[model samples]
Target: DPAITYLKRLGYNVVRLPREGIQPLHLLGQQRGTVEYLGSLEKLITQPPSEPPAITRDQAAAGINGQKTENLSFSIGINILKSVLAQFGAGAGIEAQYNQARKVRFEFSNVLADSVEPLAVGQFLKMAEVDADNPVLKQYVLGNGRLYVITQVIKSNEFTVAAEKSGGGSIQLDVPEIQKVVGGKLKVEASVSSQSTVTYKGEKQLVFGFKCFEIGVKNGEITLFASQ
Candidate 1:
């Protein structure tokens, strides 16, 4: 598998991801809110903005397991963005349902006890479209050469930045580790929204901080494969 080989080159021994780790396109997190017409939807005449950006001033940097990382920040500017979106509600009658995507939280831990590796967002996706048995772990091709990654979209995720020398950072391959505790869940073929007062913050992405080297993704979660 090319995806498997890709990870192996980066020092990751295993790459079996959990079916549950399949982050749907809707829930994958927002990037930048714009009025883009998605092919999947037809019911709504107005194209709803998935998640929009808000005024957030977060500046954080961290390192984990002795590995240094770029700046990382943490905050759920739900209140800030909601108020901003409210400006549209009175004049445009914007439906809350349109921007109603519930916030999801993830906490990935289990750092390998070795020299840590720093992963830039530049080398994250490796085309994990080949898990026949597990529908949750597959990627799909849209009509226009656009890849719809349902599992673990990093564009719009939340991370809590607590430490610099010991915790908080995002890494690729080898042992990607420790922490993304959000407040939602991912299911099969759908984006389920629970009750939440959180507002839409388009891809306000969070950079994870952890003590890891490379990553092994298998068994529905990201991990280091022990099977050589």
Candidate 2:
């Protein structure tokens, strides 16, 4: 966690979120605005602790801005959607297990920068070309509002413990259930750090982190993949 330490060294508060962080859809304008419009952001890499702590919906919901909510529109691969279905037999626990996988942590580092700047990586995503020929990037860009390269795809754990400390419950998914899934897997997520600034305690601070606004599946495949 040298990056986390680095942020602290510079007198900046650090907030590391689940790769499947607080969903923009789950948040209101104020929350979405806080993520999209406020604060400098970047996506840094952090070592996965053996047992990652949980992040509550309330914590994810709370922002420096008060009483505001926002909206988001993105596409998620059907597989990612099915993973949720496999667990609760419904979509309720999607965000919860998303946090549980806790594979590679998405670093929301250096939370105070000079001017409120748009993320370089976020901006770089503007050049992403979408097409009917290649549906993966198209669905990805549409759903996640960003680009992703799948590094590895692994089987979802035979037993998944959705810890509730941060938010969701300690529910487990059976191995048989996972095997039944076509693409019932979790794919590693990749993203570069971006920049921004937010007014905190009366001063503008540097904020650097990557965006994971919504879930997207590659090529319109409906597999059980979660970005961690």
Candidate 3:
């Protein structure tokens, strides 16, 4: 239940706690790595410093005594300071982990289309209507004149369309058109691209640029929603 407890502390209201019928050790062992990692972190605070050196009087009293002593070994003091600083840094990291745990939340929704309207089948094709300004699509279509379109509709009100096989390969979406069809609804979609062609292995993922429509006669007033 540490995960659930951490999530609840972070501000997530719908955290899923383990069933009470199960034993505590079973729950703890369910996610052994996470529990061990957290436990190790907690133990670090109480664990004695490894290979700690002895602090000599001359080294400890050097500054206080204002004595100019030769070979006053200060490595132990330095090591102790370093160890304290390292633990302080680790504490900051754990605090960050706790903060992140608190912000966790869950959402369940469909993928391809929203309840209002399906993804526009010919969005890029429609954009290609104007040849001069359609540089992106023009490069995609070349002389073929036929548009290759890829459409995805999610139950979560998310939608995406892209040109897969055209000379001008690109993803497309019409915010105004979507608004006109589905007003006051959350929506998002984006084009997928690789950062480095040499090492990239994942599919060209479409990034969903999202928006929320405002209340109006026309759907153009909607602003992008913050969350997916």
Best by lDDT: 2
**What is the Cα-based TM-score of model 1?**
0.15
lDDT of each: 0.24, 0.26, 0.19
TM-score of each prediction: 0.15, 0.18, 0.14
Tally clashes: model 1. 33
Better of 1 and 3 by lDDT: 1
- Model 3 residue runs over 4 Å out of place are 1-112, 115-130, 143-147, 150-152, 155-228
Against the hidden true structure, what lDDT does model 2 obtain? 0.26
For model 1, state the Cα shift of residue 56 in Å: 36
- Model 1 over residues 1-228: C-alpha lDDT tens digits? 221232232333222231112212211211243112123211111223443222122333221212112322442221222225333221111111112121222222222111111222112322232232433223211111121212111221322211112223222121111133332222222133232122222343422221122222333233321222
Global CA lDDT computed for model 1? 0.24
Score candidate 3 by TM-score against the native: 0.14
Top TM-score: which candidate number? 2
lDDT minimum window of 10 residues, candidate 3: 93-102
lDDT of 3 at 33: 29
Model 2's number of clashes is 35
For candidate 3, write residues 11-44 as lDDT tens digits. Answer: 2211132111211111011121222101211121
